[PDB]
């Protein structure tokens, strides 16, 4: 049996590998290389341009946190945008909120969505929900053209090497700002504090031009590089995203496996060296 | 340039690798294989029986948390035992406390200590401190024979495959209990919540026979398997180890890179699925 190994110039000198039980699908889409495999111990795995995007065993950590942080703080969110996220995980977590009326997703590569619907049915199950609308389209263009404004935007982007390159700059954060309601919130994937501190500092600077509160949270997830990944958290209000305004107590949330009320706030208590790096931004 | 790869039956189906800048020392001691290398990006690395024990880049996370959790809760700790920990990292963090009068360490393999003194000088620097006493000896035997009792015991053990096999059972926890002062505390390395939940549950059960409060905390550290490792936290008192009784404000603590007052408590807020697993223990 072979192993899959994840190498990258974004994490030089380190690699993470999973043993392959069997290869399920590979293709070269118009935008990237797509690989899907059953691992021996982490279930099925999705790989894009040789970087792991999710595994069945741990995906709930990243999807629950990315979704329920902003959604428990937004009072009455009605319209939510997901940028990237073709796998559907964020959407699955959003659909649990009865109050949400519309969910839009903007994903440039429809092959990601289709592969997720076929091979990852417990992740892509939200696509059946009537409130969900799909747009196959560059996120920049989508944000420039959309007429609606949103209560929450969740940027579930890949890394800056690839089609997600455009989602890590100042202009983008402007468009997000203009696309949010006046009390609206954006959370975005924002890399590992163990290795990408330069990026984290840049993203925070970009966000601080526009938003009045920019905060950063960390998630433990073994199949992203260095075992964690953070959330850049942007608020148009004094008060920010560190404290939930509700508890997820109805039956649709009984199955949550990571998120809870306490660990929402705990995710924002960061290692001392990171506080120091981002103190005078 | 070659890569080092960390395989194990304790984490089947996954491996983590670091690129080797150069090999510095290898030997077979009486107890295990010892390898030391300079990595391209994580500095120097110590390997025991093919498992990473520390790297210079991230060791502060595990050593600060393991030490300052119990030491900020113990009111006036005078005598502290470290079990295992031949590298010296815990000792380095202990020496920062002016109030401590004695530090004993019990490590079975003196080659670990000696290699750390030669190759890892910013880790093994506490061995120069006059309060430090070294015992080359099985921990079980040491605990059976010691006459003194301790304010804090820190069990910085390797994994259960190896000489640290004896440190993961009921009898051991008895001896620790008998070796502590009546208000004393023990913290112990207790594995990754992402993969070793059976072990975490067993260790907690063992501890709960004896101690009136057993709690579990998590540390983010990229070079241990799954990117995190936990602390089993044992208290003879109602009150436990989740809340510090002091702040580390004197000049000897200004250099801390992970631990702070807030993230002490935050480390005990665990993922929902782990709470559920250990609820009826
Ligand atoms: N190296 C960290 C990678 C994090 C990726 C998170 C993620 N997973 C995705 C799946 C489909 C589309 C966009 C995505 N963004
Ligand atoms: N797979 C997790 C390994 C954790 C090891 C922590 C550790 N590092 C050590 C260095 C010297 C002696 C005992 C040690 N215990």
Author numbering:
A (entry chain A), B (entry chain A): 41 to 321
Question: What do the paper's sentences say?
Answer:
In contrast to the other inhibitors tested, the complex with BIPA was obtained without any ligand bound to the dcAdoMet-binding site of the enzyme. In the structure containing only BIPA, electron density for the ligand was detected in the active sites of chains A and C but not chain B, presumably owing to crystal contacts with the neighbouring asymmetric unit restricting the conformation of the monomer. In addition, the gatekeeper loop in chain B was disordered and could not be built into electron density. Despite the different scaffold, the benzimidazole moiety of BIPA occupies the binding site of the dcAdoMet aminopropyl group. Although BIPA has no inhibitory activity at 1 mM (unpublished data), it is unique among the ligands studied to date in crystallizing with PfSpdS when bound alone, despite anchoring only the N-terminal part of the gatekeeper loop. The remaining part of the loop has a conformation similar to that found in structures with ligands bound to both parts of the active site. On the other hand, the complex with BIPA shows that ligands with certain scaffolds may bind alone to the enzyme and still form the interactions required for loop stabilization. The binding mode of BIPA, on the other hand, enables a different manner of loop stabilization. Thus, one amino group of the imidazole ring appears to stabilize the N-terminal part of the gatekeeper loop by forming a hydrogen bond to Asp196, although the backbone carbonyls of Ser197 and Ser198 and the side chain of Ser198 are also at a hydrogen-bonding distance. The absence of interactions with Pro203 at the other end of the loop may be one of the reasons that BIPA is a poor inhibitor of SpdS.
Spermidine synthase (SpdS; putrescine aminopropyltransferase) catalyzes the transfer of the aminopropyl moiety from decarboxylated S-adenosylmethionine to putrescine, leading to the formation of spermidine and 5′-methylthio­adenosine (MTA). In this work, X-ray crystallography was used to examine ligand complexes of SpdS from the malaria parasite Plasmodium falciparum (PfSpdS). The active site of SpdS is located between the domains and consists of two interconnected clefts for binding dcAdoMet and putrescine. A conserved flexible structural element called the gatekeeper loop covers the active site of the enzyme.
